[PDB]
């Protein structure tokens, strides 16, 4: 809701970036993605989120990790759909968890895990 610039380094990820989105704090912001968003202004986190996912769709190493239907979603700024086993009610797409626009404190998690995180689980 409040503007600001994106900061952070992120981390290198393998060809299975979101395999742990449903565990612990999920997956980190890929370093390559952080390089594209670093120092950019965003009117709101939601804005950061759209931009984040659009960047993902443009990174060859990450996009290939998603199906055609999920890449199309990311291309328009929407988070990819999670597997059915990871949804939670109407929350059916990956979410961003804060540990601001500090990419080093932001992670990607499934809805089910995100709920548990905020409940101490």
């Amino acid at each position: 809701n409040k503007p600001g610039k994106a900061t952070g380094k992120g981390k290198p990820v393998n060809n299975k970036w979101l395999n742990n989105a449903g565990k612990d704090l999920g997956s980190p912001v890929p370093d390559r993605i952080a390089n594209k968003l670093r120092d950019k202004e965003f009117k709101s986190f939601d804005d950061f989120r759209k931009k984040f996912w659009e960047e993902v769709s443009k990174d060859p190493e990450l996009s290939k990790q998603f199906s055609r239907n999920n890449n199309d979603r990311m291309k328009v700024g929407k988070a990819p759909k999670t597997r059915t086993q990871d949804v939670s009610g109407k929350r059916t797409s990956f979410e961003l968890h804060h540990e601001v626009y500090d990419m080093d404190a932001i992670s990607v998690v499934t809805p089910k895990r995100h709920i548990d995180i905020h409940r101490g689980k």
């Binding site: 199906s67 239907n69 999920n70 199309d72 979603r73 328009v76 597997r83 059916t92 797409s93």
Partner: protein, 86 residues
């Protein structure tokens, strides 16, 4: 378009149109309409993996409308359920 009550009401071609409609809503600003179409897809196919057929296709088949239809057809047959309209 029109949402039929079951797989037996859809010819393969018609099912492909429903998939393309889902694809169109997939790139819409919101998931409001998409989600209702996805619930309908899950309901009529009755496949246990539901939306995964769409967003997480198996490596053993093509990530395409044709592939989705094929996998669905093979599963419904393997489970003795009515197939697409002829």
């Amino acid at each position: 378009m029109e949402l039929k009550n079951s797989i037996s009401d859809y010819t393969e071609a018609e099912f492909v149109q429903l998939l393309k409609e889902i694809e169109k809503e997939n790139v819409a600003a919101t998931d409001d309409v998409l989600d209702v179409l996805l619930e309908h897809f899950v309901k009529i196919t009755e496949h246990p993996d539901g939306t995964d057929l769409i967003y997480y296709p198996s490596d053993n088949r093509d990530d395409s409308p044709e592939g989705i239809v094929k996998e669905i057809k093979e599963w419904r047959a393997a489970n003795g359920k009515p197939g697409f309209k002829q």
